[PDB]
Design an enzyme around this catalytic site. Structure first.
Site, PDB file in Angstrom:
ATOM      1  N   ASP A 148     -10.402  -0.321  -7.723  1.00 43.65           N
ATOM      2  CA  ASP A 148      -9.533  -0.551  -6.573  1.00 43.65           C
ATOM      3  C   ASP A 148      -8.805  -1.889  -6.623  1.00 43.65           C
ATOM      4  O   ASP A 148      -7.743  -2.021  -6.009  1.00 43.65           O
ATOM      5  CB  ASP A 148     -10.344  -0.455  -5.283  1.00 43.65           C
ATOM      6  CG  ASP A 148      -9.520  -0.762  -4.053  1.00 43.65           C
ATOM      7  OD1 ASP A 148      -8.506  -0.071  -3.824  1.00 43.65           O
ATOM      8  OD2 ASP A 148      -9.885  -1.695  -3.311  1.00 43.65           O
ATOM      9  N   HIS A 204       0.824  -1.209   0.000  1.00 41.99           N
ATOM     10  CA  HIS A 204       0.000   0.000   0.000  1.00 41.99           C
ATOM     11  C   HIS A 204       0.863   1.266   0.000  1.00 41.99           C
ATOM     12  O   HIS A 204       0.857   2.062   0.936  1.00 41.99           O
ATOM     13  CB  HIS A 204      -0.952  -0.013   1.188  1.00 41.99           C
ATOM     14  CG  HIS A 204      -2.004  -1.074   1.108  1.00 41.99           C
ATOM     15  ND1 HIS A 204      -1.721  -2.416   1.233  1.00 41.99           N
ATOM     16  CD2 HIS A 204      -3.342  -0.990   0.921  1.00 41.99           C
ATOM     17  CE1 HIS A 204      -2.838  -3.113   1.124  1.00 41.99           C
ATOM     18  NE2 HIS A 204      -3.836  -2.270   0.933  1.00 41.99           N
ATOM     19  N   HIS A 217       0.432   1.902  -5.830  1.00 36.62           N
ATOM     20  CA  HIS A 217      -0.970   1.494  -5.815  1.00 36.62           C
ATOM     21  C   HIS A 217      -1.888   2.695  -5.989  1.00 36.62           C
ATOM     22  O   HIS A 217      -2.878   2.639  -6.738  1.00 36.62           O
ATOM     23  CB  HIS A 217      -1.272   0.767  -4.508  1.00 36.62           C
ATOM     24  CG  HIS A 217      -2.714   0.426  -4.313  1.00 36.62           C
ATOM     25  ND1 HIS A 217      -3.341  -0.583  -5.007  1.00 36.62           N
ATOM     26  CD2 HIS A 217      -3.645   0.945  -3.479  1.00 36.62           C
ATOM     27  CE1 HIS A 217      -4.601  -0.662  -4.620  1.00 36.62           C
ATOM     28  NE2 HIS A 217      -4.810   0.254  -3.692  1.00 36.62           N
ATOM     29  N   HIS A 276      -7.203   7.408  -1.828  1.00 33.84           N
ATOM     30  CA  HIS A 276      -8.073   6.423  -1.201  1.00 33.84           C
ATOM     31  C   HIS A 276      -7.362   5.599  -0.136  1.00 33.84           C
ATOM     32  O   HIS A 276      -8.018   5.081   0.772  1.00 33.84           O
ATOM     33  CB  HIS A 276      -8.695   5.516  -2.263  1.00 33.84           C
ATOM     34  CG  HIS A 276      -7.775   4.463  -2.784  1.00 33.84           C
ATOM     35  ND1 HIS A 276      -6.754   4.736  -3.666  1.00 33.84           N
ATOM     36  CD2 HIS A 276      -7.741   3.128  -2.571  1.00 33.84           C
ATOM     37  CE1 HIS A 276      -6.120   3.617  -3.959  1.00 33.84           C
ATOM     38  NE2 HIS A 276      -6.698   2.626  -3.307  1.00 33.84           N
ATOM     39  N   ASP A 277      -6.039   5.466  -0.213  1.00 32.31           N
ATOM     40  CA  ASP A 277      -5.243   4.739   0.775  1.00 32.31           C
ATOM     41  C   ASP A 277      -4.077   5.593   1.247  1.00 32.31           C
ATOM     42  O   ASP A 277      -2.931   5.146   1.291  1.00 32.31           O
ATOM     43  CB  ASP A 277      -4.718   3.420   0.216  1.00 32.31           C
ATOM     44  CG  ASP A 277      -5.803   2.379   0.035  1.00 32.31           C
ATOM     45  OD1 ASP A 277      -6.741   2.342   0.854  1.00 32.31           O
ATOM     46  OD2 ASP A 277      -5.715   1.588  -0.928  1.00 32.31           O
TER      47      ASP A 277
END
Ligand SMILES: CCCc1nc(C)c2c(=O)nc(-c3cc(S(=O)(=O)N4CCN(CC)CC4)ccc3OCC)[nH]n12
Ligand SMILES: CCCc1nc(C)c2c(=O)nc(-c3cc(S(=O)(=O)N4CCN(CC)CC4)ccc3OCC)[nH]n12
Ligand SMILES: [Mg+2]
Ligand SMILES: [Mg+2]
Ligand SMILES: [Zn+2]
Ligand SMILES: [Zn+2]
Lengths: 425, 57, 51, 422
Positions: A319, A158, A162, A198-199
């Site tokens: 995703d 992550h 990504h 998003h992460d």
């Protein structure tokens, strides 16, 4: 001290009780005046901590010079420039639209350095044709997508790659799957932007370890613990001068995009997808009976509720797109994910003293080809088949997914055959 | 620490006034007084003098 | 929390309120629900509230 | 009701007052939720900063090279082979003259300063006596290296020179006789983090703009922040070098560090000068005796007044360097004032002090002979009587002063000539 009565008579027994109950009450009431100071100190400590966080994830004066090389071509600093002057510098430095083929479904990133991805990212914001319409200052754009780059941590899976891959897949869907017709430009600005965050600050552990370890994250939020942490940090990042790319918008548009971003971010939690999956199939079926493709556009582009259900599904279809790529990248991404899973298993066994489940046990690392196969049947095979029946431009994803499933099942069969052979004697 | 040094080095004298039953020193830093005959005349004092019409007695 | 405060403030005054039984009920303060709960209503399932 | 008769007015008012009070008293349960959210949000945001100022698993392989020589991770090694692996890495205390008064770090990379700071602990013979681990020490030094900002003057380069000077005082000036080893360790490790996370503005700009620092603390705003952040860093496992101390020793070390860090504020130096001037003078009455030795090191107030002066003489040590270094350092120290002038001119719309605005760029030397005369000429005089071996510093300042003076006079003539003829 009370100094004189109005009747003329001295104080007596009743007055002592009357004027003593009041002082007892006012003495007991200081709990609030203590709580006041405690809150007024907690607030200040939180503000100081926020500023210290903000310093380390921004771009200094000497860091943006690696992207727009002013101070050599011109004598002035980036802040003292005209808007049309910076465009000339930006045109010659950014990569072209066709150099890195960012218009395909097969774009692999592991052949480029971590600095190229930033320039490709800010190129995408020019491909949409959105910088001119809303007049976002061009220094803020670079500074923002450099701060977001430095915002991610440095772990196995992550990380920043990504976060770039998800946004690239979303852009590909918007501009090659022709799903741009249903949405206006303002509702694509806040989707491409919401794909990059998003992460943003992932620790490296899923939502279950957070509950089983009593992390302070699990007490502030109650449901979808991590997915709500990625949203307030992003809205904190894009809420200050020199990083606010939404400043030239008016009130209504700003409210619209802020309302439209949280749905997209929170929709990436897998548990929500299982529950609200059926409602998408009904829309898919309603699309069929209509006469022509063009007529369907004028019907869908008006109803509001039905568009949100499509956005909150494109976000999951993006995703986990890493399963649809050719069989030269999947064979490595699988091991990259397995590394993080094994690390979480080791933490579980060492700290809290329990037995890890077979998914996260480092010892049994030979049954990996089997589990993966199940995953393809359990979650991936639906989202992509539905999108394939919806539009016709999204078929290569489906066939590549089928091919990868075949390969993984072949490997699993070989492993099982070897295991059975070993047990003969 | 920078206030207990002068006492321990002969620069000043130790305190000698009254003490609250838990050891603190008795000094008032605010005095709110009300007058209710004739005029309302509410008042606040930031640091009472040595002879106020209340503390003098 | 609110539940403990009422249960310590009403238990101390049994004698002054000469009554046989008494009861207290607490309402819920959630004005507006999330996005993922409204959707089933606006799409033709779980008909709306009537009370 | 317990009498058989129905409720009436006098039983309506009572139970109406009861429910009015209960309705008003719901303020408290809400503040409970607000507290239990503020505390958790503070914890999350304070744990976010600890990832950015800590040395992770890689980048510690640039000092401890365990992978190539042994093939195993640092936390798997023993107390031995680790001293062995770092024996050949650290520099030598003789070649670089670590314990002299003329050390200059201009031709050195930031990575070398870390490996000299690590050596300083070995020189004092403190590692073995208190059984501190190795990984914790190296991580602590690299974390302190990463904890400073990148502003012009108050960077890690200023955090190394103020610790090296105190090591030189404790070893070459022979001030170690009065102090035990624990206090020496505490002082050396509290000289490095004296100005940590310094924004770049003095204590007045913090009160003018009503920064959140100005509300949490009340006096000497920045020193308390430095101390709090340092102690927060020291309380993390894998960064705690006080793992093998009992309660008493740990408490004593923390108290000494606390007293040391807050004493580097100039507003507390102007009022605590006569006490030191008297402690120095009373030392002569133990004549013909070098064995007074702080009454055989039994007094405690005097050992806590000498330390503050040592810290405030280490802090300003830059003025006692050779001329070829002071000339370069003065411009760096002026740049920060010039930069603060612009911020307070624009944000607050206020006219700056003449030492801050760039327009008096030629008035720099004059001010530099006021400071020397006002603040930093007393200390190096008194120490020169307290001990003689630290005389070479007292000469330093004098030489520098002369040069500055000459330069200023030249400028004066340039201003004097043009006005008269015009
Ligand atoms: C949350 C993981 C998301 C993900 N992204 C990718 C590319 C992958 C991938 O290749 N493989 C897996 C992946 C998924 C499963 S699963 O089907 O057991 N799965 C069920 C749903 N729960 C929900 C929290 C997670 C576990 C098992 C093994 C997996 O990969 C092992 C390397 N997961 N995965
Ligand atoms: C930053 C202050 C401490 C300091 N360290 C060094 C090495 C230096 C240095 O060379 N020069 C100066 C320095 C000091 C003054 S001062 O004497 O006016 N001074 C009085 C005290 N106040 C604070 C309470 C600050 C201003 C004026 C100019 C100075 O430097 C200009 C280059 N200050 N300084
Ligand atoms: Mg996620
Ligand atoms: Mg300081
Ligand atoms: Zn993701
Ligand atoms: Zn300093």
């Amino acid at each position: 001290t009370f100094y004189n009565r109005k009747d003329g008579k001295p104080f007596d027994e009743q007055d002592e009780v009357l004027m003593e109950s009041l002082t007892q009450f006012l003495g007991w009431s200081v709990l609030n005046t203590d709580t006041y100071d405690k809150m007024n100190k907690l607030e200040n400590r939180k503000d100081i901590a926020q500023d210290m966080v903000l310093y380390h994830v921004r771009c200094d004066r000497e860091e943006i010079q690696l992207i727009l090389p002013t101070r050599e071509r011109l004598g002035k600093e980036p802040a003292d420039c005209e808007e049309d002057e910076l465009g000339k510098i930006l045109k010659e430095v950014l990569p072209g639209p066709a150099k890195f083929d960012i218009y395909e479904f097969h774009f692999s990133d592991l052949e480029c350095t971590e600095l190229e991805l930033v320039k490709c990212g800010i190129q995408m914001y020019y491909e949409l044709g959105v910088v001119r319409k809303f007049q976002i200052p061009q220094e803020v754009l670079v500074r923002f997508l450099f701060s977001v780059s430095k915002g991610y941590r440095r772990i196995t899976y992550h990380n920043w790659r990504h976060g770039f891959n998800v946004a690239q897949t979303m852009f590909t869907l918007l501009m090659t799957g022709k799903l741009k017709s249903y949405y206006t430009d303002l509702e694509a600005f806040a989707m491409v932007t919401a794909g990059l965050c998003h992460d943003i600050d992932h620790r490296g552990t899923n939502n279950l370890y957070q509950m089983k370890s009593q992390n302070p994250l699990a007490k502030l939020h109650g449901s979808s613990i991590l997915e709500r942490h990625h949203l307030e940090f992003g809205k904190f990042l894009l809420s200050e001068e020199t990083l606010n790319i939404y400043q030239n918008l008016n009130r209504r548009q700003h409210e619209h995009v802020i309302h439209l971003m949280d749905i997209a971010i929170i929709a990436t939690d897998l548990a929500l997808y299982f529950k609200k999956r059926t409602m998408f199939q009904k829309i898919v079926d309603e699309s069929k009976n209509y006469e022509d493709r063009k007529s369907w556009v004028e019907y869908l582009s008006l109803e509001t509720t039905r568009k949100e259900i499509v956005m909150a599904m494109m976000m999951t279809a993006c995703d986990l797109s890493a399963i649809t790529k050719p069989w030269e990248v999947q064979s490595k991404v699988a091991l990259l994910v397995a590394a993080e899973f094994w690390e979480q298993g080791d933490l579980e066994r060492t700290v809290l003293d329990q037995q890890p489940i077979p998914m996260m046990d480092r010892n049994k690392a030979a049954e990996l080809p089997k589990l993966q196969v199940g995953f393809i049947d359990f979650v991936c095979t639906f989202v992509y088949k539905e999108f394939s029946r919806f539009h016709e431009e999204i078929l290569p994803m489906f066939d590549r997914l089928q091919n990868n499933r075949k390969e993984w099942k072949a490997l699993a069969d070989e492993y099982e055959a070897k295991v059975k052979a070993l047990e003969e004697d | 620490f920078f206030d207990v040094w002068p006492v321990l080095m002969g620069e000043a004298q130790a305190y000698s006034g009254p003490r609250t039953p838990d050891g603190r020193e008795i000094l008032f830093y605010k005095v709110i007084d009300y007058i209710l005959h004739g005029k309302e005349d509410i008042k606040v004092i930031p640091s009472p003098p040595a002879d106020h019409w209340a503390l003098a007695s | 929390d609110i539940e403990r405060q009422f249960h310590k403030a009403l238990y101390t005054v049994r004698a002054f309120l000469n009554c046989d039984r008494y009861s207290v009920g607490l309402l819920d303060m959630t004005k507006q629900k999330e996005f993922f709960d409204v959707w089933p209503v606006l799409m033709g399932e779980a008909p709306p509230y009537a009370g | 009701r317990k009498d058989g008769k129905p409720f009436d007015e006098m039983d309506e008012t009572l139970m109406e007052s009861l429910t009015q009070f209960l309705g008003w008293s719901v303020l408290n349960p809400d503040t409970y939720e607000l507290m239990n959210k503020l505390e958790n949000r503070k914890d999350i945001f304070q744990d976010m900063v600890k990832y950015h100022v800590k040395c992770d698993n890689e980048e510690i392989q640039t000092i401890l090279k365990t992978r190539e020589v042994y093939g195993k991770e640092p936390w798997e090694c023993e107390e031995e082979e680790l001293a062995e692996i770092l024996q050949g890495e650290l520099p030598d205390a003789d070649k670089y003259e670590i314990n002299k008064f003329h050390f200059s770090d201009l031709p050195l990379t930031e990575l070398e300063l870390v490996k000299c700071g690590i050596q300083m602990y070995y020189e004092l013979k403190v590692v073995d006596k208190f059984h501190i681990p190795q990984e914790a020490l190296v991580r602590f030094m690299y974390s302190l290296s990463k904890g400073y900002r990148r502003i012009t003057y108050h960077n890690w380069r200023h955090g190394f020179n103020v610790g090296q000077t105190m090591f030189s005082l404790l070893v070459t000036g022979k001030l170690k006789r009065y102090f035990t080893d624990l206090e020496a360790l505490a002082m050396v490790t509290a000289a490095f983090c004296h100005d940590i996370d310094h924004r770049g503005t003095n204590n007045l700009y913090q009160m003018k703009s009503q920064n959140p620092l100005a509300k949490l603390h009340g006096s000497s705003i920045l020193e308390r922040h430095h101390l709090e952040f340092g102690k927060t860093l020291l309380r993390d496992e894998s960064l705690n070098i006080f793992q093998n101390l009992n309660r008493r020793q740990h408490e004593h070390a923390i108290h000494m560090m606390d007293i040391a860090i807050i004493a580097t504020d100039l507003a507390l130096y102007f009022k605590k000068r006569t006490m030191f001037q008297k402690i120095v003078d009373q030392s002569k009455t133990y004549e013909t005796q070098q064995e007074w030795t702080q009454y055989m090191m039994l007094d405690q107030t005097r050992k806590e007044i000498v330390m503050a002066m040592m810290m405030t003489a280490c802090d300003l040590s830059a003025i006692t360097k050779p001329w070829e270094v002071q000339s370069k350092v003065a411009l760096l120290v002026a740049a920060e004032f010039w930069e603060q002038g612009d911020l307070e001119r624009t944000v607050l719309q206020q006219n700056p002090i003449p030492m801050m605005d760039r327009n008096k760029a030629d008035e720099l030397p004059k001010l530099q002979v006021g400071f020397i005369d006002f603040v930093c000429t007393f200390v190096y005089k008194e120490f020169s009587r307290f001990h003689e071996e630290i005389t070479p510093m007292l000469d330093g300042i004098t030489n520098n002063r002369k040069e500055w003076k000459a330069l200023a006079d030249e400028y004066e003539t340039k201003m004097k000539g043009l006005e008269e003829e015009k």
